[model samples]
Target: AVQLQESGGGLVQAGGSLRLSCTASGRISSSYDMGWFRQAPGKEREFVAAISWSGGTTDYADSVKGRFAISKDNAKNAVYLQMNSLKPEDTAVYYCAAKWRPLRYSDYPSNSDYYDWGQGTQVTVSS
Candidate 1:
């Protein structure tokens, strides 16, 4: 089975930055799409960003377009999320997910669905 562990998330000062990482139990192949999502206090979950399995293309939600970045390090089988210029409203539990598709369907359109998710890491921004 596929597993993902998320690390990094703690009290962050306003205007500071935070970096989170998701490590996969096995190799993260090019067929595996990686993404990040977050749920604010009392709010619904929202998509942060995603990296496509093909050519490692990335897409970010409009709200975090300039403040968030996502990347992967195949050497460590880990994907990283970096957010800058944080604020109190940024407090939330962040989750990393993997979207898997069969090798035979590589030519098919990609969906927004995710297969695996991390337990989530809580981030608190203080003034």
Candidate 2:
């Protein structure tokens, strides 16, 4: 019964950053990597980046240079994601994903291989 949960604000301002948290359940998530992805304004979603408990991390296919970070609070079984340079176009559901494997292999690039997924924290951008 592994589950991923996201907790973030709904409103963000221009040039602001979007911060969100993902809480894992039913399993020990600290041993795995936690990643974040964004679904564009109306298009699809893609891989953001991931961080392992060992401090190793990876970025996305298109946004390999994107500014994001995932930190794990092992005591709480939660991993938090912070995204910068937020814009209206960046508004979408921010999801906290549990890596399907401890290794760097996945089924798809857009983070489809996320073993556990958060329902998504709805985000909106405005003036």
Model number with the top lDDT: 1
Best by TM-score: 1
Which stretches of candidate 1 lie above 4 Å from their native place?
A: 103-111
Clashing pairs in 2: none
Candidate 1 contains a number of clashing pairs equal to: 0
Model 2 weakest 10-residue run by lDDT:
102-111
lDDT agreement of model 2 with the native: 0.68
Q: Give each prediction's root-mean-square deviation over alpha carbons.
A: 2.5, 3.6
Off by over 4 Å in 2: 29-31, 60-66, 102-112
Relative to the true structure, candidate 2 reaches a TM of: 0.76
Query: Residue-wise lDDT of candidate 2 within 2-113, one digit each (tens)?
Result: 6888898588887788778888776654346677777866688877666664455545545634665656676787777776776676677777777645454543223457
Writing each residue's lDDT as its tens digit, candidate 1 over 1-127 gives 5699999999999999999999989876667788898999999898888876455778888878589889888788888999899988889999999887666344332436788999999999999
